[PDB]
Design a protein around this ligand. Structure first.
Ligand SMILES: */N=C(\N)N(C)CC[C@H](N)CC(=O)N[C@H]1C=C[C@H](n2ccc(N)nc2=O)O[C@@H]1C(=O)O
Ligand SMILES: [Mg+2]
Ligand SMILES: [Mg+2]
Ligand SMILES: [Mg+2]
Ligand SMILES: [Mg+2]
Ligand SMILES: [Mg+2]
Ligand SMILES: [Mg+2]
Ligand SMILES: [Mg+2]
Ligand SMILES: [Mg+2]
Ligand SMILES: [Mg+2]
Ligand SMILES: [Mg+2]
Ligand SMILES: [Mg+2]
Ligand SMILES: [Mg+2]
Ligand SMILES: [Mg+2]
Ligand SMILES: [Mg+2]
Ligand SMILES: [Mg+2]
Ligand SMILES: [Mg+2]
Ligand SMILES: [Mg+2]
Ligand SMILES: [Mg+2]
Ligand SMILES: [Mg+2]
Ligand SMILES: [Mg+2]
Ligand SMILES: [Mg+2]
Ligand SMILES: [Mg+2]
Ligand SMILES: [Mg+2]
Ligand SMILES: [Mg+2]
Ligand SMILES: [Mg+2]
Ligand SMILES: [Mg+2]
Ligand SMILES: [Mg+2]
Ligand SMILES: [Mg+2]
Ligand SMILES: [Mg+2]
Ligand SMILES: [Mg+2]
Ligand SMILES: [Mg+2]
Ligand SMILES: [Mg+2]
Ligand SMILES: [Mg+2]
Ligand SMILES: [Mg+2]
Ligand SMILES: [Mg+2]
Ligand SMILES: [Mg+2]
Ligand SMILES: [Mg+2]
Ligand SMILES: [Mg+2]
Ligand SMILES: [Mg+2]
Ligand SMILES: [Mg+2]
Ligand SMILES: [Mg+2]
Ligand SMILES: [Mg+2]
Ligand SMILES: [Mg+2]
Ligand SMILES: [Mg+2]
Ligand SMILES: [Mg+2]
Ligand SMILES: [Mg+2]
Ligand SMILES: [Mg+2]
Ligand SMILES: [Mg+2]
Ligand SMILES: [Mg+2]
Ligand SMILES: [Mg+2]
Ligand SMILES: [Mg+2]
Ligand SMILES: [Mg+2]
Ligand SMILES: [Mg+2]
Ligand SMILES: [Mg+2]
Ligand SMILES: [Mg+2]
Ligand SMILES: [Mg+2]
Ligand SMILES: [Mg+2]
Ligand SMILES: [Mg+2]
Ligand SMILES: [Mg+2]
Ligand SMILES: [Mg+2]
Ligand SMILES: [Mg+2]
Ligand SMILES: [Mg+2]
Ligand SMILES: [Mg+2]
Ligand SMILES: [Mg+2]
Ligand SMILES: [Mg+2]
Ligand SMILES: [Mg+2]
Ligand SMILES: [Mg+2]
Ligand SMILES: [Mg+2]
Ligand SMILES: [Mg+2]
Ligand SMILES: [Mg+2]
Ligand SMILES: [Mg+2]
Ligand SMILES: [Mg+2]
Ligand SMILES: [Mg+2]
Ligand SMILES: [Mg+2]
Ligand SMILES: [Mg+2]
Ligand SMILES: [Mg+2]
Ligand SMILES: [Mg+2]
Ligand SMILES: [Mg+2]
Ligand SMILES: [Mg+2]
Ligand SMILES: [Mg+2]
Ligand SMILES: [Mg+2]
Ligand SMILES: [Mg+2]
Ligand SMILES: [Mg+2]
Ligand SMILES: [Mg+2]
Ligand SMILES: [Mg+2]
Ligand SMILES: [Mg+2]
Length: 248
RNA sequence: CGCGCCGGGGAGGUGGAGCACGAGCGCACGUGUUAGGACCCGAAAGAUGGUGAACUAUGCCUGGGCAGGGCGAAGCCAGAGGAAACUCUGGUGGAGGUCCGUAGCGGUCCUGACGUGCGAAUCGGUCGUCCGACCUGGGUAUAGGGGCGAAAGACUAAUCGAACCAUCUAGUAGCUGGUUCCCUCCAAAGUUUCCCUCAGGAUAGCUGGCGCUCUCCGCAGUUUUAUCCGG
RNA sequence: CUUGGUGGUAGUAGCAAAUAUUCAAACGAGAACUUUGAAGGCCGAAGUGGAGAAGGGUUCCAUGUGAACAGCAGUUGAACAUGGGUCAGUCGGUCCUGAGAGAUGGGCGAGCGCCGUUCCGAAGGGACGGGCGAUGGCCUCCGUUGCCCUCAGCCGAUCGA
RNA sequence: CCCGGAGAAGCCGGCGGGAGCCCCGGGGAGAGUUCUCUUUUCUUUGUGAAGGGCAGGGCGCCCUGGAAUGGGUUCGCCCCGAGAGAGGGGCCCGUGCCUUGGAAAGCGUCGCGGUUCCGGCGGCGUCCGGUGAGCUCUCGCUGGCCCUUGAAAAUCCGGGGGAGAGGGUGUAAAUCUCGCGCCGGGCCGUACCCAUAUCCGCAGCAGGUCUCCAAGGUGAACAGCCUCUGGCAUGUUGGAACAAUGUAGGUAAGGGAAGUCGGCAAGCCGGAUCCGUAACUUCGGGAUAAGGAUUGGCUCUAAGGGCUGGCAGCCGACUUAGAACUGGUGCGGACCAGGGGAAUCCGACUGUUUAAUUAAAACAAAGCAUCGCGAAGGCCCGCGGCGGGUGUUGACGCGAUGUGAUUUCUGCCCAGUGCUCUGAAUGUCAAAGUGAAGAAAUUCAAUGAAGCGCGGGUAAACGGCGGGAGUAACUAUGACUCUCUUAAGGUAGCCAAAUGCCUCGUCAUCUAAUUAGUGACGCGCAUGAAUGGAUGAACGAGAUUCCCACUGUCCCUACCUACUAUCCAGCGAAACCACAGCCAAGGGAACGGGCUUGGCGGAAUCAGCGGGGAAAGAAGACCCUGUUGAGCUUGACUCUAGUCUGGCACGGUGAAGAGACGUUUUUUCACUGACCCGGUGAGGCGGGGGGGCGAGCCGGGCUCUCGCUUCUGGCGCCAAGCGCCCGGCCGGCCGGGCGCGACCCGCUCCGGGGACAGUGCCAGGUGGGGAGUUUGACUGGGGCGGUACACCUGUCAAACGGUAACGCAGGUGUCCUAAGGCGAGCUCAGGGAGGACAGAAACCUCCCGUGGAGCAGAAGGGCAAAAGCUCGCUUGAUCUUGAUUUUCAGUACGAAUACAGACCGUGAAAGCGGGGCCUCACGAUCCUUCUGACCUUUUGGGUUUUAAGCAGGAGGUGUCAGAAAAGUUACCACAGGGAUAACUGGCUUGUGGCGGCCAAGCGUUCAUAGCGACGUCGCUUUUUGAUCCUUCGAUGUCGGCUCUUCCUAUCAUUGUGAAGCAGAAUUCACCAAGCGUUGGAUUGUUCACCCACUAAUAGGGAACGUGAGCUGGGUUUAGACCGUCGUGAGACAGGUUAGUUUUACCCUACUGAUGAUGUGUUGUUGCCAUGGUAAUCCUGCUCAGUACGAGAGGAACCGCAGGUUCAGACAUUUGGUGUAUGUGCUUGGCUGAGGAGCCAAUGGGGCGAAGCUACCAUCUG
């Protein structure tokens, strides 16, 4: 009968992201002759805490090579970096933390972050707190590379694409228990309206397919098809298994 | 005229809204049955097009606001015992979804007052919390099978288990209710059969009115005499 | 049933939230309630005080009136009738942008129209100096229009406290 | 041009500085006080912005110098070779002080003129000091908090740069962010209220509505209480009374929850100091635990500080400890201000929630555990697009669920139903496409995607977790074993719990007494493991139970106060209303105000009162009917957006192979030009030279790299140089241009995909996410149950025929190749006597044999050379018109009967035969299908396929004269119904209750003292049932409380009879219902059971009396928890907890109160016809330790003394009350002090007159 929560979110308007105090987008430097052939120097002017994000950012100042004008970028901070540190970047960049070079050059077993999935997008994969990717093996023919991501999906990518060296800071966040409702409340106030998560079962049987009944119970099987209309797709999606996960 | 896989006749049964020396059309009047808003008045709902978040639901931007006391976390200072490890004793500091409690915020109980009320939800005394998921003003966003909900089917201008205004719309009713002058003459039924029929119809039955063909031989809710039947 | 009018019920129910009035004098036809004075009380700076906002829109002030209204009366009043009254470079709006709304280009749309706000756009009418041309002035020196050379990143029209 | 800054940031705490206010001590000017005191008490007692100076704070600023035997220093900190202490400096704020403004003005005072209309005019004064945990505002410093780190742009400014301009020793110049001097600053709002009377609520409505300011005292305090500044007349009126009923306030001897569903309400406790403080525990808490003592006034001592020259002297704050005295033991003196403990259940906590009946045990919440997904992606919106949100995002993330802190545990079951993985090993499987014959439409045939099947996996997916047998040396039980059924068969733990019917389970404790409560037991109707089980400190406006103290909650009521009600002056409604308003019985729609018959009846009126008027209220919400709906559900029916899958088109260019049906069907491998994606202010791409740093070869050939930047928080733009040109001036000057410097040529800006995704059109699938609709009838209420819904026999049927009930006894939805058709010939059931095996029963024979057997079936009728049984030949169970009968409307179907015309069968022949000996065994229109004629039409004519026609059978409608169809509503809605229930009322009385007759037996004996079987006759309507006449436009539905009267079927008392009666005690019966019949524990209970006294603890009605008389615990709304059932929405004469109880002023009625006619008027003292009616019972003494009786035991009558209950009065005494506001005391403030007083909603506490008044005092019956 009614339109349920899941559906009401898609139009948005209420659930859009709060973006007053966000500093900006965290994109890498754009491609150009210098990066493609040689290298370009750049200092770390300052570090900054971005809202809604575990990791911190960095005000990185470079110099524009064609016009007399200092550009600026917002890199994501690898661990161990500090202000007053010369950050090189390019093809001929030396291998040490805080230094952007294409993956192809570095050997196998190299740990990287802020990686591009396709060339030019200015850095999409692996840039949250405590993550890093592992370079497994190159492939001279076709000029492509094999890379295992933290989740485990191994992916091939063109060797040309870029990556900032080192892991992302802020690891071990999930270690501390979020003790009180308020401490959670503030977090989701920074990000989005989602926090107080009401169980569908409690609702009346208009607002949920599991609702109603005199006794609190679901009544029907909680596994469900993916060939299914919007409104029903609810519960455990395409559940291959469903139980106390013994072993791994 | 073309002759043949041509045409035409007779008798005898049977089906027909036919013949058998025509009787209709036009106009007016009455009654009766229908179709339409159709004897008058009456719905719960249905569809199309528009208007509202001045209360309230919730998110966001920019502003405002909350005495005085108790409890006394880490850190720090000092003294004492001790072989060492170290441990005991007294001060300081002022933490916290901490405690008593005011304004504010809320509104449990007395099932107290009032109950043609001061009031289409107020008053009294008694109650919970009061630095926090705290309280609040103005601006702004979301609109009806749609919005919004710490989820009660709550709320959406006193209206919500589908809002409000007009139009389609005099919407249908086997159901209640009402239905306007006199006299005279005649005068009933509630039973049969069929129906998604049992609060209803048709259909036979009962009733009236209009007449017409003959009358100054026929018929009867009856007996008698004969004659059968009856279980 | 509809509209309009009138009865009994009735000169009854009733005019009970938060302590409170009293004496003399004046105008006046008339005074429990008007005014002055005197005496006694209350609100007791989280105010029954002094100032503002939104909002109301002449209710502010004076003179006169006593029909109607102020659920008793009233010589009174926020009632009625006459007339008056709001003066800024410096106090605010006006300027700015904020969450956001909203044009243009572009696309969609039988269609009134709608999406979308930098996204598929030839998105500058500006400036200083040089040369050449053109006028106006005690043509001194300096203005006032034009071309050519040389230079220019924006960012999205516009509203929004 | 570039770089950079301000504008530009959160909350909280502490501390310091500066103002305003407050206070103190002296000075002046005027007021008030003076019975007595009082150098008294009160008011008042000033300098703006903008400039200059100086104070006064701050500084992460400089210089000198170099510290450990470490120093300085803050309440806390912190700081130091990255340069401390100690000197000298600098800067920043300067709302404070001085000054120009400015004493002329202003204010306070005294006095002169103007008669006046006057910013009138003159004296004087407007002083000097001190204080502070005080308050308020502000400036600054410094900490603490964050999975929260707390706005932008307009606008303004500084610096790095150095393109360029300027005059030749002067009246110098271009140029100045320096000091004066000139002009101008438009448009619009601007009054007032800003709220117990200017706003919104229909109004001058106790409601609601955002801010600033903010004195004295008491005190922890902005608490409460009183006063000044300022404001006001008690909030839409007054006077006279002071009764009951109310509303809000108080207090009570003795007792202390006994009242009651329940300690509901009120009351006790309350602040501080000093002692003291257990169980348990997540070791933080619990904790103001508990439990004690003190507290006043007045008069003293002592300890804590500043400033200048181990000291002195001058000043000033508030606190703390201590001591003596003194009072009628009063003292936190008013106000403000916590009742406690032991236990159990639930939920962890704080929070939120139904605006207007539910604040909870519901939700959330942290923790836990699953699932999808690496972007051409997941999830969703969207009518649409190369669209949009999450996304300024990227697996420690977004997204979808479940569970509910911690600790501890988390057993077995994948058969079912879901989900999912594998998919030629594969049954089925559409369009198009491909072969096949045919004149062609065609039809046939192969080929064949996903999906269903098939097979794996899965329970922190929905979910589930038996029974029978045998077995231990007492019985029991069953360790152990087997089997049936399913895929296992309840493991660990727990309980008559919020889950247990029977049930008040049983035992113990808790009570004198306990259906409650707590601890064990377990057979568990129906416990149980993240649909989570068990525990568990702290917390709860949560649910129950008990204990302490405490109380007018109760025995048991009384008194007082204010506001009313009451009477008066003024002003002034509405609901409601057929007529009206005294009763009993009677019959009547079965409870009448009117009727009949009886009883009766007297003006007009007041304050109260709640019995009635089936009172008002709202076209009954429960129930039923309705061919009336909505909300929701799913395995109902019929469809749909979306998503998955194949085909055709947009859609190219080449490579190799097999073959394929010079060609292809197709498998791979490329290319790119459509097309698609991403980035850029679309900035140096690919080739070819030349140049260089290195390796190898013979100035030369070849390959690759580079093209010049890695110790450091710097700067970096607007071209140097050269060559070649020339332009004006005069070999030199001034001003110009091009190209190298910075290689040349090109056709897509760079990359990645790419002929596939994709878009458009068809086709199959999936699809309660969504839409539309349906969800039979009869019915002794409906439902559940039957089918009496179409058929047939017998009876009921009352002697023609015809007749009903969910009446009776019963049957049917078939069977037959002959069990049909002719003819002939036989005669059955049963019994008797005989005969080897032979038998009660096997086979043969004679005799009897009216049918006693049989004819498929239900029963009934019918039949003997047959309708039975056996042989022989056959198929009239065929073709075809009409007529009639049965049901009946005298319409159909079916079923059958008489004839007729053909072809036949059989029998010698007359004949017989068109299905089953008779009475039941079955079906319309429309559509499809088959058969049938040299049949008709197929449209301008002709031929031939196909189709349509015509006639006769079949496929089926059993709700059987024929819609195609599942559930729920306690969230509910509408029309109506007493044609129809759940209470009452009526008639009946089975059942229940009571009572008679006969007398077989008990009672030793003796039937009948007392009882009475087998049988039998009656009454009653407080039980229960059966019925539906009344009311559904509403009669308020269970219990208790309170209160009156009434019945008698006598429990006790009075009088008397009879006993298997000696007395006592106890039994049965008559007259008799006037007077009595209790207090409590448990349960909502009526009922039940128990303790205690008694004379006795009998039974019942009146609308199951009694709701505008109460209460609202239970039933019986909405919220929620559990078990079982149901896949689910939901359900339960199965448990649990929270949940608006309306109006009286009418008529009558009763109560009390004025009054009325008549005697001519008026008093007076008096009379009684009528109504009403009252007393009750018990104890002791004596009689009497006697009569009686063996004794044990053991009375009665008259008298005497007292008591209970009830009724009627009074208030001498005791008690209560006490606002005579009578009188002492007293807390805080106010009147200068003393005295005398007042306010604090009765300020508080003592004692208390009068008067009212109590079995709580007394009297009489
Ligand atoms: N959903 C629940 N839990 N219940 C109890 C049903 C609620 C229904 N909707 C109301 C109701 O009361 N139903 C009753 C009402 C009466 C009716 N009934 C009563 C008496 C008699 N003799 N016969 C009846 O049929 O029964 C209904 C019932 O119990 O189902
Ligand atoms: Mg729907
Ligand atoms: Mg649903
Ligand atoms: Mg707290
Ligand atoms: Mg408290
Ligand atoms: Mg009440
Ligand atoms: Mg009102
Ligand atoms: Mg605002
Ligand atoms: Mg929408
Ligand atoms: Mg909320
Ligand atoms: Mg929410
Ligand atoms: Mg609910
Ligand atoms: Mg509900
Ligand atoms: Mg009409
Ligand atoms: Mg109508
Ligand atoms: Mg009716
Ligand atoms: Mg007979
Ligand atoms: Mg009265
Ligand atoms: Mg009166
Ligand atoms: Mg009032
Ligand atoms: Mg009053
Ligand atoms: Mg007061
Ligand atoms: Mg004012
Ligand atoms: Mg005025
Ligand atoms: Mg008056
Ligand atoms: Mg001016
Ligand atoms: Mg638009
Ligand atoms: Mg503007
Ligand atoms: Mg503004
Ligand atoms: Mg002065
Ligand atoms: Mg003003
Ligand atoms: Mg008001
Ligand atoms: Mg008023
Ligand atoms: Mg008054
Ligand atoms: Mg007492
Ligand atoms: Mg007492
Ligand atoms: Mg009792
Ligand atoms: Mg009680
Ligand atoms: Mg109480
Ligand atoms: Mg305790
Ligand atoms: Mg909770
Ligand atoms: Mg509510
Ligand atoms: Mg309530
Ligand atoms: Mg789960
Ligand atoms: Mg489990
Ligand atoms: Mg399975
Ligand atoms: Mg128990
Ligand atoms: Mg178990
Ligand atoms: Mg559960
Ligand atoms: Mg279970
Ligand atoms: Mg359970
Ligand atoms: Mg426990
Ligand atoms: Mg009056
Ligand atoms: Mg009547
Ligand atoms: Mg009455
Ligand atoms: Mg009544
Ligand atoms: Mg109704
Ligand atoms: Mg009705
Ligand atoms: Mg109907
Ligand atoms: Mg019907
Ligand atoms: Mg419907
Ligand atoms: Mg749908
Ligand atoms: Mg419809
Ligand atoms: Mg029926
Ligand atoms: Mg007969
Ligand atoms: Mg007969
Ligand atoms: Mg024949
Ligand atoms: Mg036969
Ligand atoms: Mg038809
Ligand atoms: Mg039919
Ligand atoms: Mg009987
Ligand atoms: Mg005998
Ligand atoms: Mg009836
Ligand atoms: Mg009635
Ligand atoms: Mg009534
Ligand atoms: Mg008698
Ligand atoms: Mg009754
Ligand atoms: Mg009532
Ligand atoms: Mg009553
Ligand atoms: Mg109940
Ligand atoms: Mg189930
Ligand atoms: Mg008498
Ligand atoms: Mg004797
Ligand atoms: Mg006395
Ligand atoms: Mg007294
Ligand atoms: Mg004195
Ligand atoms: Mg006394």
């Amino acid at each position: 009968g009614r339109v349920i929560r899941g559906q009401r979110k898609g139009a948005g308007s209420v659930f859009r992201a709060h973006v007053k105090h966000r500093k900006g987008a965290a994109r890498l430097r754009a491609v150009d002759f210098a990066e493609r052939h040689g290298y370009i120097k750049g200092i770390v002017k300052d570090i900054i805490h971005d809202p809604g994000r575990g990791a911190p950012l960095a005000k990185v100042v470079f110099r524009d090579p064609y016009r007399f004008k200092k550009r600026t970028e917002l890199f994501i901070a690898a661990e161990g970096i500090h202000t007053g540190q010369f950050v090189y970047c390019g093809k001929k960049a030396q291998l040490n933390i805080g230094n952007v070079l294409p993956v192809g050059t570095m050997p196998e077993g190299t740990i990287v972050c802020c990686l591009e999935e396709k060339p030019g997008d200015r850095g999409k994969l692996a840039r949250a707190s405590g993550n890093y990717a592992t370079v497994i093996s190159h492939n001279p023919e076709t000029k492509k590379t094999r890379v295992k991501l933290p989740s485990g999906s191994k992916k091939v990518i063109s060797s040309a694409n870029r990556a900032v060296v080192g892991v992302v800071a802020g690891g071990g966040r999930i270690d501390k228990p979020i003790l009180k409702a308020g401490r959670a409340y503030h977090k989701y106030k920074a990000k989005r309206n989602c926090w107080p998560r009401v169980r569908g079962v409690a609702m009346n049987p208009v607002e949920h397919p599991f609702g109603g009944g005199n006794h609190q119970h679901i009544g029907k099987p909680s596994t469900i098809r993916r060939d299914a209309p919007a409104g029903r797709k609810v519960g455990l999606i395409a559940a291959r298994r469903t139980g106390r996960l013994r072993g791994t």
